[PDB]
Automatic annotation (TrEMBL):
It comes from Novosphingobium subterraneum. This is Uncharacterized protein. The lineage of its organism: Bacteria, Pseudomonadati, Pseudomonadota, Alphaproteobacteria, Sphingomonadales.
Length: 17
């Protein structure tokens, strides 16, 4: 997902809560 707190497929991700 978008540059958030989680991790995507090799990048920063964002969670909905």
């Amino acid at each position: 997902g978008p540059p958030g707190d989680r991790i995507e497929f090799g990048v920063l991700a964002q969670l909905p809560g």
